[PDB]
Design a protein around this ligand. Structure first.
Ligand SMILES: Nc1ncnc2c1ncn2[C@H]1CC[C@@H](COP(=O)(O)OP(=O)(O)O)O1
Ligand SMILES: [Ca+2]
Ligand SMILES: [Mg+2]
Length: 341
DNA sequence: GGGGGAAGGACTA
DNA sequence: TCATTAGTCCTTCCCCC
């Protein structure tokens, strides 16, 4: 198999630069303003001029401003980025029928039936990068390899505005030399448990007793890492179908007062229903982020679709369960709908 | 023993 | 007054066959 992965560069910030070219070359920070206080919220993404200085996805907006007080700070306009993304995803459909849209700015294309080798794969990558630049003036990074994982790693290595092929020989080299924390699916918690076992490279999972690996990181992650290390990882590119749709908002102030929480919960339901657009969910979950930042949730599955009115009444009973079973104050509240008919 | 659900846990972008 | 938003797959605990 030959997989070609496309990863749009610093996407939300790049879209803002396309819509306002005077922003080019300047640090641009796209933020999720929570409304609690002046600049409360976090950075969704920043362009590379901003990242060079440490301003990146995830940090508090107030911290970003301490580092780059004069950067351009813009509020996230998700619908705009989603419309631009949808147009780019339609351009990709022309290069393969087998495409897995992984997120708003990533797609995997199985081009095995389209090219004969990596030289042709690389040329198709350039064609794709050019097509997207021509139509939308958006740069992207292409990663190419024998499976999804390494195609993604190739993109991580080459972004931004790059293209890279990780051939069979390099895959073998990476299995020996790539820091295992850089393998997709291995976050800080798993990376720490692996460091602690002396596992710093994929190759190392082949010499540890399987049960010892599994006991520390779980059966699925152990089998995953071992299959990559044996160069036997096989996961097909498959059309993705959304399995859940939801909305979670931040409250002005923390609370565990039902009447004070309701308006936020109801606004989350209204927005979620708008997003469902014709999809009819059989399940609803109320999700709360507590003051200390833990996530708590309660849900219910019905034998039939949930009308908006049933969503309103059931969300209140589920929120009560959360309040009745957890004594902490709530910071963010929302709903998630799933099990579509 | 293990299918299936609810809720938490990690991780991703 | 640091700490968003959204979605996916896995683990754990429990009921149940
Ligand atoms: N921490 C985050 N919170 C919210 N959105 C995020 C976060 N991290 C990434 N994203 C979203 C926003 C832009 C979209 C793609 O990200 P971007 O292209 O900037 O990532 P990268 O440069 O790593 O490719 O993913
Ligand atoms: Ca990207
Ligand atoms: Mg990592």
């Amino acid at each position: 198999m030959i997989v070609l992965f496309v990863d749009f560069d610093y996407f939300y910030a790049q879209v803002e630069e396309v819509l306002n070219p005077s922003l080019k070359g300047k640090p641009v920070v796209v933020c999720v303003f929570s409304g609690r206080f002046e600049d409360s919220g976090a950075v969704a993404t920043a362009n590379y001029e901003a990242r060079k200085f440490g301003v990146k996805a995830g940090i508090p907006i107030v911290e970003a401003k301490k580092i780059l007080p004069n950067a351009v700070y813009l509020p996230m306009r998700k619908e705009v980025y989603q419309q631009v993304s949808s147009r780019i995803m339609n351009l990709l459909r022309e290069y393969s029928e087998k495409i897995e849209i992984a997120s708003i700015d990533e797609a995997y294309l199985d081009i095995s039936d389209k090219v004969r080798d990596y030289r042709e794969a690389y040329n198709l990558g350039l064609e794709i990068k050019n097509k997207i630049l021509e139509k939308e003036k958006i740069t992207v990074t292409v990663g190419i390899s024998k499976n999804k994982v390494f195609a993604k790693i190739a993109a991580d290595m080459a972004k931004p505005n790059g293209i890279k092929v990780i051939d069979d020989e390099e895959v073998k080299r990476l299995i020996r030399e790539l820091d295992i924390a850089d393998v997709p699916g291995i976050g800080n918690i798993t990376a720490e448990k692996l460091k602690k076992l002396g596992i710093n490279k994929l190759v190392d999972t082949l010499s540890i007793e399987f049960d010892k690996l599994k006991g520390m990181i779980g059966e699925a992650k152990a089998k995953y890492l071992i299959s990559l290390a044996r160069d036997e990882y096989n996961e097909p590119i498959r059309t993705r179908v959304r399995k859940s749709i939801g909305r979670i908002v931040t409250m002005k102030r923390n609370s565990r007062n039902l009447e004070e929480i309701k308006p936020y919960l109801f606004r989350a339901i209204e927005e979620s229903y708008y997003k469902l657009d014709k999809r009819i969910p059989k399940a609803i979950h109320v999700v709360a982020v507590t003051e200390d930042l833990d996530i708590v949730s309660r849900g219910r599955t019905f034998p039939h679709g949930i009308s908006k009115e049933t969503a309103y009444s059931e969300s209140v009973k589920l929120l009560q369960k959360i309040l009745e079973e957890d004594e902490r104050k709530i910071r963010r509240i929302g709903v998630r709908f799933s099990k579509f008919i």
